[PDB]
Structure 1
Amino acid sequence: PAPGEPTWVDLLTPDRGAALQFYSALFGWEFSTSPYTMCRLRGREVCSIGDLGENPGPALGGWSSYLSVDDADAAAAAVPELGGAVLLGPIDILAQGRMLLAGDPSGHRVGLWQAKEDDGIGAYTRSELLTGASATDGAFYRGLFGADFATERAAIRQVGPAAPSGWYPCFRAQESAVPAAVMLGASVLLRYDCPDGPAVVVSAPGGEVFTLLLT
């Protein structure tokens, strides 16, 4: 796993049961019928879905993207020098690896995962950053991962002031998944083009946002 490569996405939601119904109906994910649910397709783990804990107030579930780093401590030392912020960690994760949470110069949050060790419809293909400051953010991420970063797995897309911004997971899909998701109660926020096909940014009924990569 190259540095900066998208390696995992995780959904934290205040209604996990509804999220499982929605994403199983949209992507066909399987989970056996615990604080989290592993989502599988074609015998492979795709992602996980977990609970936002009991809260005395409203709560907004969102997808959390993780990019690979070779050394979480070096990444933590570099983040502030590149104009970002360390929000949590570096922290060890039960021998899975070492995790840090980082903010880029614009305040977009991203997980950085130092691991101690599929493509096809419904698979997690990558995460993309939607940003109104692609030059500032881009310099940050290329200083952290290298000059090749965000050149054509991860990508950086320029968006206007009214679009969602931040890192969003991209799941492979057919054109027909768009009405499917709308019929399931999702709302399309934006349609843009990538080298490998159109992308549709979607707000799920729970309000979390993800991208359908139509290929």
Structure 2
Amino acid sequence: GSHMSHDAVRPAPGEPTWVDLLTPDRGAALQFYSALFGWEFSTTSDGTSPYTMCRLRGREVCSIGDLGENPGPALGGWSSYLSVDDADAAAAAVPELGGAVLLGPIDILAQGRMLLAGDPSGHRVGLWQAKEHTGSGPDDGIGAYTRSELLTGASATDGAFYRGLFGADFATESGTDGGGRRAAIRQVGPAAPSGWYPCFRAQESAVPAAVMLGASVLLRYDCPDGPAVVVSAPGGEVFTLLLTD
């Protein structure tokens, strides 16, 4: 052990951190995404590696692993994780805002604590408490992260939730226009999908490509930053495609 330099990204709360994707069929997943955008993968010297590191033009994208048997009715797939000032406190805010803390705040190997909330169906939604220095550095191209949205049939209420995390209640109440470079609450109905779905830049030609692979659309809406469409991948996880030329 010894002390050395370090570089952490996203010092203040509100900025994106990372997202993990759990799918039952890793082998198929790779193919799927590969045909959407063509994200590269990391090469391991050893035999069968535990997980695959998905990279694009030398830019860490994400990691995809297997699920197993009997996943559950509603997982969420892409588990959004945003840094906060005081997760411990958010736990108390959860109920106060009209939610339910599923798991946490719990310490994991004295490295970090995370928070979970949502419905008992298995919706994984919360925030991660950054303590130590973490590395990051996304890119600004087709395929890179864009933003995150909350597909719910009660935005009126969901809004209150975020409001208490980092809205007017707090000082870090960033956000003028109707969502740009931060997470926002979206309103839907019963026929439409539900759950946190991140946004991924793609081409018009990728839209149909996905279908061919065995995916289906749920809802199609417009947005100021571009057209956004919700697509349910065969794995179970749902993702949002945003066309950008």
The bucket for the TM-score relative to the shorter chain is: 0.7 to 0.9
Query: How many residues are treated as equivalent by the alignment?
Result: 215
Judge conservation of contact 1:52–1:61 (CA < 8 Å) in 2: no
Judge conservation of contact 1:9–1:66 (CA < 8 Å) in 2: yes
Judge conservation of contact 1:13–1:61 (CA < 8 Å) in 2: no
Q: Structure 1 residues 56, 128: CA separation in 2 closer, same or farther (over 3 Å shift)?
A: closer
If you compute each CA radius of gyration, which structure gives the higher value, 1 or 2? 2
Judge conservation of contact 1:127–1:170 (CA < 8 Å) in 2: yes
Q: Deviations over 1:32-71 (max 9, x none)?
A: 9944322111212111112213449999772222122122
Instruction: Tell me the CA shift for residue 169 of structure 1.
Output: 1.4
CA RMSD of aligned residues (A): 3.3
Instruction: Tell me the CA shift for residue 3 of structure 1.
Output: 3.0
Q: Structure 1 residues 104, 207: CA separation in 2 closer, same or farther (over 3 Å shift)?
A: closer
Residue 242 (structure 2) pairs with residue 209 (structure 1) = no
Q: How does 1:77-96 map to 2 (within 5 A)?
A: 77-94=92-109
Q: Structure 1 residues 108, 149: CA separation in 2 closer, same or farther (over 3 Å shift)?
A: farther
Cα distance between partner residues in 2 of 1:80 and 1:110: 14
Q: Structure 1 residues 151, 130: CA separation in 2 closer, same or farther (over 3 Å shift)?
A: farther
Structure 1 unaligned residues grouped into runs of 5+:
none
Q: Structure 1 residues 56, 174: CA separation in 2 closer, same or farther (over 3 Å shift)?
A: closer
Judge conservation of contact 1:95–1:116 (CA < 8 Å) in 2: no
SS at match of 1:7: strand
**TM-score normalized with structure 2 length:** 0.76
Judge conservation of contact 2:166–2:172 (CA < 8 Å) in 1: no
Q: Structure 1 residues 35, 148: CA separation in 2 closer, same or farther (over 3 Å shift)?
A: farther
Instruction: Tell me the CA shift for residue 173 of structure 1.
Output: 1.1
Q: Structure 1 residues 104, 72: CA separation in 2 closer, same or farther (over 3 Å shift)?
A: farther
**TM-score normalized with structure 1 length:** 0.86
Judge conservation of contact 2:76–2:122 (CA < 8 Å) in 1: no
Cα distance between partner residues in 1 of 2:207 and 2:217: 8
Judge conservation of contact 2:73–2:121 (CA < 8 Å) in 1: no
Structure 2 unaligned residues grouped into runs of 5+:
1-10, 42-46, 133-138, 174-181
Instruction: Tell me the CA shift for residue 200 of structure 1.
Output: 0.9
Q: Deviations over 1:90-146 (max 9, x none)?
A: 123446532111228999541311223522111122211011100101111111122
Judge conservation of contact 1:11–1:62 (CA < 8 Å) in 2: yes
Residue 180 (structure 2) pairs with residue 170 (structure 1) = no
Percent of residue pairs identical: 100
Moved more, 154-163 or 35-44: 35-44
